[PDB]
Structure 1
């Protein structure tokens, strides 16, 4: 009675992994690597489509990670290689009479630097942070990179400010958006919509605290691959921003010397005025409310009448023990141990000391170091704290700051999107018979 009828253009799809392209609208990230964006992108709501999402198996994160690293490395190719700086330094303390937390930090180091002509040498004096200089045995020091890697000096005209990147699917593929408000990163989404491109995601690089980006709409959302496995990270998405005000109060005077035929090295020459420590301010009332909400949500997974304790991070490199971020081109490493100390049992700011480093080993790699030129004057930035990365350590659970794997800073925006392949061909029984 029934015959096979073939249909092409059938609204079905299957899970797939493909290459996405970017759209955007100097800077370390750039628009010449991407296409123009659509000024009026469309979103089509699927009224009766429920799809299963899993943010922990989403291959868009791996591509975003690879693309960001590739852009980072490409932006350092037409720049100055600081091989003449792996020399013996003769250092003294810049301001030995300080009683502040910067005593011992900022050393006045002299060295014999190369110049335009190969026959001549230039005596150079510059200031270096303690964290960038290793004692070898004025005292003799070396740059920290001489032990493991070469340094490339980042181009001073290339900005490090994140530019939103829109990821777009190639023809034949579509991106599905969850659009749910209580979605925890896994399981079904009953309100799936189809989009061509994702929203603009800022490539913000940070640890422990996630700065800028999107917020939860109704409540703090606790997302984890397992929850009960303490080896996994917990990503906490806040429903309100917490403002953090960071500053580098020192009025640094930057000098520039030529180190070769067409190459120049930038360094801090002197500091005008008093020497002050870089720091960040978070208010007590907002942070206390934020933690109260986080604890309220954590008690839904570990039960009620369970004591939730926050504590500072423990061991490891500063990249994971501190809050690392780029503030106006400078790399801050904020202690945060004033933000995570408390036990929760069933205008008055918090100032976080921050250390600054000039030699950066980014993306958990060895052998490719970057030197961040100093920036003239005083630096101030204001950011929103949009989420936290926590790790779990009876009756009391202890949570500590975690981070350092940048994929977890991206598997926090690219959690509502899935890439699917369109399968337009299919068959079905009908009563339609070919004439023959």
Structure 2
């Protein structure tokens, strides 16, 4: 009958706003930043009888996480030693004991009128030849990416270990979480709740397998923006983890030199014992059951087709191998022996690189210093990134090849259940009471 103005109305609208990062209480990164302590025993308020429309794609939380991860990485590397002085001709020979070469070069010193003779072991993947090789007992080589840009040494005192972080809404905004399991990433969610902060998300970097993530509450869930369109990447969320143990079985002796005032350069000096290839061991029975279950779930979406898991097409290691950071070492593992089926460990050969072009940004190379001794780490495989071949012609089959690309499909694997909304407390309604 009459208009009444109400303030505090439980209504919200979709909005894009900056969300601060908060980490659990008690050097590093992901802790120096994200310092804000989280609440102990955080609250979640379930909204009864509330259905909301969620879309894990076009989720601004992913773009913010992407930019924060890149920005923090670059800020961490900024105050570190530049390796521009080392873009010199290298004279490399076979290591006395061809993945690793013994390279001699003339490095700078703190005095600009003096140079020093340095011997170092480098991986072949970090070196580009200038001359035909196998001439005499040595040949001239250049560091990879020297022509493209400067190489910055990561600070050896700062670690990038992916501790969990939480994203929190600023006052006036709220984060809605989708509680319903089996949600495919788009459309309505019939069980939602309101939270202030997200759960703890580990900023783990990988290209084919998703490591140390969350497990599905129920069954394996296949999420893709458009399964028909083979351009889009399919994210597979597992309900059980598969254990993978990776190692670099080489007892390295690490040496360091000064290359300018206060500028220390770290490199591998020698290897004690013989030289062995890095590798990963993935439990065979868990992998086989996992792949059979994924094949089953894909069959439900691609009926009357053979589900063929195959290797990636040949190309640069960055787009064909499983990449990961194991205690600062960068592994590039050849997973063609895993995706070899058609619906006691499996050993995966791995290559190691020290000069890394992260996030497909050409022009900002980083050098990862070596760690003495041998490296071993263990992780939980919690999901997969698959790309459907999508050829128009096939003998009633569908081929699913491992593919990653954007790290942005890794962060979508954790943020798919969250939406950020703005509270709109002012509204009107009819009443029977006149102002008079």
TM-score range (shorter-chain normalised) is over 0.9
Taking the TM superposition and a 5 Å limit, the aligned residue runs for 1:195-234 are 195-234=195-234
- Secondary structure at the counterpart of residue 292 of structure 1: helix
Aligned to 2:157: 157
Secondary structure (helix, strand or coil) at the match of 2:359 reads coil
Structure 2 residue corresponding to 1:359, chosen from 355, 366, 369? 355
**Aligned-pair distance for 1:33?**
4.6
- Cα drift, residue 121 of structure 1: 0.7
What is the deviation of 1:75?
Answer: 0.3
Spell out the pairing of 1:269-280 with structure 2 (5 A cutoff). 269-280=269-280
Among 95, 109, 118, the residue aligned to 2:112: 118
CA distance in 2, matches of 1:134, 1:29: 34
Q: Secondary structure at the match of 2:57?
A: helix
Q: Using the alignment, how far apart are the partners of 1:36 and 1:204 within structure 2? A: 21
Gaps of 5+ in 1: 98-103
Residues 50, 158 of structure 1: alpha-carbon distance in 2 compared, 3 angstrom cutoff: same
Partner of 1:101: none
Separation in structure 2 between the aligned mates of residue 16 and residue 22 of structure 1, nearest angstrom: 18
TM-score by length of 2: 0.96
Q: Is 1:383 paired with 2:382?
A: no
Q: Partner residue of 2:37?
A: 36
1:100 aligns with: none
Matched, 1:373 2:369: yes
CA distance in 2 between counterparts of 1:28 and 1:118 reads 34
Q: Which residue is 1:179 aligned to?
A: 179
1 CA distance for matches of 2:3 and 2:28?
57
| SS of the residue 1:66 aligns to | helix
Q: Aligned runs of 1:33-432 on 2, under 5 Å? A: 33-95=34-96, 104-137=98-131, 138-303=138-303, 305-344=304-343, 347=344, 349-393=345-389, 394-432=395-433
Cα distance between partner residues in 2 of 1:15 and 1:33: 25
- 3-state SS of the aligned residue for 2:145? helix
Q: Name the CA distance, whole Å, in 1 between partners of 2:172 and 2:218.
A: 35
In the TM superposition, residue 315 of structure 1 has moved relative to its aligned partner by: 3.4
SS class of match (2:5): strand
How far apart are 1:67 and its partner, in Å?
0.3
Cα distance in 1, alignment partners of residues 65 and 47 from structure 2 = 27
Larger displacement relative to structure 2 (33-42 or 61-70): 33-42
| Contact map agreement 1:29 1:72 (CA 8 A) in 2 | no
Secondary structure of the structure 2 residue equivalent to 1:57: coil
Q: CA deviation at 1:320?
A: 1.5
Aligned partners of 1:302, 1:90: CA distance in 2, in Å?
Answer: 55
Task: Tell me: CA distance 1:158–1:198, structure 2 relative to 1, closer, same or farther (3 Å).
Answer: same
- Cα distance between partner residues in 2 of 1:387 and 1:409: 9
Deviation at 1:35, TM superposition (A): 1.2
Distance 2:16 2:315 in 1: 35
Q: Distance in 2 between matches of 1:156 and 1:115?
A: 20
CA deviation after TM superposition for structure 1 residue 328, in Å? 1.1
Q: In 2, distance between residues paired with 1:199 and 1:32?
A: 17
Contact 1:208/1:320 (8 A) holds in 2: no
- Residue aligning to 1:23: 22
For 2:168 and 2:316, the matched residues in 1 are separated by: 36
Alignment partners' CA distance in 1, 2:175 and 2:314 = 40
Write out per-residue CA displacement over residues 295-333 of structure 1, whole angstroms, 9 at most, x where no aligned residue. 111011111x42100100113321110000001110000
In structure 2, how many angstroms separate the alpha carbons of the residues matched to 1:32 and 1:406?
Answer: 20
Q: Confirm or deny: 8 A CA contact 1:21 1:34 kept in the other structure.
A: no
Cα distance between partner residues in 2 of 1:357 and 1:32 = 27
Structure 2 stretches of 5 or more lacking a match? 132-137, 390-394
Q: Distance in 1 between matches of 2:149 and 2:311?
A: 31
Once residues 113 and 86 of structure 1 are traced to their aligned partners in structure 2, the CA distance between those partners, rounded to angstroms, is 9
